[PDB]
């Protein structure tokens, strides 16, 4: 049986090959734009010219992940796998997964220390490999900002004269004479005047409309006359020189600044002063939501999305643990739950995107970095910790149906190995095919006048990329691989296969279908900072399983906990 790995691998290989055949037969017929030679022949200068330097840095990260996974796969299958194989605890049948996982090790054995040593070795290895990528990634500048001064919490009675005459003494200089008219411009920012574009379309209805146009024309004036009497206390002070603002935030953060005549009138000790962002990316529509209402919105959205995760992961856990409940057909209960979990995980990023849009952050630059961070965090709570916490709780409940000496995941780590394989062959084939994108493209071709189309749609089908989403997905699967790199070491070569396939597919996509991208280096740097979380999470799960099996009185847990504490501290 080998924990269903052979059958799962066969199914995934067949599915990936079928998806590749489908791509081979539809790529030119439908989208109208082989490709394996392109993947294996496109040098790194072409992918520099075609598609921006962002692609170069992304493939550099991918290549570093390839090499890191190669090293950990060798260092796993060569040493930590024989260590697990030399055990008489879980079982003795070679056709099983417990024979290779950590569960095949005595609670009194001396090789769990080797497990922990290899965990810290992998942590240092990942740190070095990501440091190399950070060295490769240059161009960390343009933090220069002179405008800045996004003061918040200002009382609504700001007449601009009080604030200017007070910044005359406290914060010397300040010849901007503009700061309060940046209140909550929400209703005034409609973008609903797109009905003017539909007015050119002229819609039976025949023409209709023009009444929405008249009403939205009256309202963009009612709001334009209502902007001044909507003071939410938001301030922008676009300075002339940069050294001014430097010494200025130094003086404000040095706290009573130099007194002014109007300081008492303004209550200047209660303000919040921070550097501002470029006026283009400031979301005046979301600037209305401020103070406690913003945090209540964040809490509500986070709670609703976490309940969504609890309702999305649970079906997969029950289906995977269904057969052991008695204490099943191999084609199902291994492939079906893993596929269901992968489908829900693929559906997750759109949910996170709409959730953040509802959350209404203030900065557009903080709407992509936070976007990718949120997607990665929810993917962790979606495929890695929650299914593992859920499965283990069921298994510990199954044991009670207690010898803690053998308490592991149901069918060991075979669930996560099958998940990695699914994200490797079938998942990667689906992502290459872009089935939802193709369905939307065909629906857009159909749903029209079928007279003037077939000339458009083809050009506007292409969108640059989702560097944040791709980093989040790759990092989620990479964390799944790394967290089980030592524990259940069989997953390392399968993770290597996954990452090689992902590199090939993205190497194809970033030249052949997707438009060039100009994302900020912050996304890449936060992805690098995300990669260092995988060994930390791996060592945390090593500690968690060691604690579950053998008590804290054991030196293995007495040492792994202190190592984890030091690693978290650093």
Curated annotation (Swiss-Prot):
Glycan-bearing residues: 326
GO CC terms, sorted: centriolar satellite; early endosome membrane; extracellular exosome; intracellular membrane-bounded organelle; lysosomal membrane; plasma membrane; specific granule membrane; tertiary granule membrane
Cytoplasmic side: 137-292, 360-364, 447-466, 512-521
Domain of life: Eukaryota
Keywords assigned by UniProt, alphabetized: Calcium, Cell membrane, Disease variant, Endosome, Glycoprotein, Ion channel, Ion transport, Leukodystrophy, Lysosome, Membrane, Phosphoprotein, Transmembrane, Transmembrane helix, Transport
Documented effect of changing residue 87 to E: In HLD19; loss of mechanosensitive ion channel activity
Keyword Glycoprotein annotated: yes
TM regions (residue ranges): 7-29, 54-86, 111-136, 293-320, 332-359, 365-401, 415-446, 467-484, 489-511, 522-549, 555-569
Regions of this protein lying in the Extracellular compartment: 87-110, 321-331, 485-488, 550-554
GO BP term, pick one: lysosome organization
GO molecular function, one term: calcium-activated cation channel activity
Effect caused by changing residue 413 to D: In HLD19; uncertain significance
Stretches for region Gating helix: 415-446
Subcellular location, record wording: Lysosome membrane; Early endosome membrane; Cell membrane
Membrane topology field: Multi-pass membrane protein
Post-translational modification: N-Glycosylated.
Entry annotated with the keyword Transcription: no
Effect ascribed to mutating residue 331 to N: In HLD19; loss of mechanosensitive ion channel activity
Region (Intracellular linker IL2): 138-290
Family, similarity comment: Belongs to the CSC1 (TC 1.A.17) family.
Subunit and partners: Monomer.
Protein name (database record): Mechanosensitive cation channel TMEM63A
Species: Homo sapiens (Human)
Gene: TMEM63A
Residues of the full protein shown: 46 to 710 of 807
């Amino acid at each position: 049986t080998f924990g269903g790995i052979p059958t799962m691998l066969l199914i995934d290989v067949s599915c990936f090959l079928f998806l590749i055949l489908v791509f081979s037969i539809i790529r030119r017929r439908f989208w109208d734009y082989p490709w394996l030679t392109a993947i294996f022949r496109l040098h790194d200068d072409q992918i520099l010219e075609w598609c921006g330097e962002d692609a170069i840095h992304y493939l550099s990260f991918q290549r570093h992940i390839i090499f890191l996974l190669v090293v950990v796969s060798f260092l796993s299958l060569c040493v930590i796998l024989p260590v697990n194989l030399s055990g008489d605890l879980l079982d003795k049948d070679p056709y099983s997964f417990g024979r290779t996982t950590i569960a095949n090790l005595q609670t009194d054995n001396d090789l769990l220390w080797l497990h922990t040593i290899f965990a810290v070795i992998y942590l240092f290895l990942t740190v070095g490999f990501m440091r190399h990528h950070t060295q490769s990634i240059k161009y960390k500048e343009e933090n220069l900002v002179r405008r800045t001064l996004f003061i918040t919490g200002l009382p609504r009675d700001a007449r601009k004269e009080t604030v200017e005459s007070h910044f005359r003494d406290a914060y010397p200089t300040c010849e901007v004479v503009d700061v309060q008219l940046c209140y909550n411009v929400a209703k005034l920012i409609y973008l609903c005047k797109e009905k003017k574009k539909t007015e050119k379309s002229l819609t039976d209805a025949i023409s209709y409309y023009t009444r929405m146009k008249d009403r939205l024309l009256e309202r963009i004036t009612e709001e334009e006359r209502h902007v001044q009497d909507q003071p939410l206390g938001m301030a922008f002070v676009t300075f002339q020189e940069k050294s001014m603002a430097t010494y200025i935030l130094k003086d404000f953060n040095a706290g009573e600044p130099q007194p002014s005549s109007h300081s008492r009138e303004l209550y200047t000790s209660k303000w919040t002063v921070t550097f501002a962002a470029d006026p283009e990316d400031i979301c005046w529509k979301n600037l209305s939501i401020q103070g406690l209402r913003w945090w209540l919105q964040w809490l509500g959205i986070n709670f609703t999305l976490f309940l969504g995760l609890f309702f999305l992961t649970t079906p997969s856990i029950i289906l995977s643990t269904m057969d052991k409940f008695n204490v099943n057909n191999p084609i199902i209960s291994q492939f079906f739950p893993t596929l269901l979990l992968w489908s829900f995980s693929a559906l997750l990023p759109s949910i996170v995107y709409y959730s953040t849009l509802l959350e209404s952050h203030w900065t557009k630059s903080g709407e992509n970095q936070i976007m990718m961070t949120k997607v990665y965090i929810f993917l962790i709570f979606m495929v890695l910790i929650l299914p593992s916490l859920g499965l283990t709780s069921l298994d510990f409940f199954f044991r009670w149906l207690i010898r803690l000496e053998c308490v592991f995941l149901p069918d060991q780590g075979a669930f996560f190995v099958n998940y990695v394989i699914a994200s490797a062959f079938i998942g990667n084939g689906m992502e290459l095919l872009r089935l939802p994108g193709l369905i939307l493209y065909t629906f857009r071709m159909i749903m029209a006048k079928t007279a003037a189309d077939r000339r458009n749609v083809k050009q506007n089908q292409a969108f640059q990329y989702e560097f944040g989403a791709m980093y989040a997905w790759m990092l989620c699967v990479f964390t799944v691989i790394v967290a089980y790199s030592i524990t259940c070491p069989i997953i390392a070569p399968f993770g290597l296969i996954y990452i090689l396939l992902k590199h090939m597919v993205d190497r194809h996509n970033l030249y052949f279908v997707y438009l060039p991208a100009k994302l900020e280096k912050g996304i890449h740097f936060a992805a690098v900072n995300q990669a260092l979380a995988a060994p930390i999470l791996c060592l945390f799960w090593l500690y968690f399983f060691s604690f579950l099996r053998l008590g804290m009185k054991a030196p293995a847990t007495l040492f792994t906990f202190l190592v984890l504490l030091l690693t978290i501290l650093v």
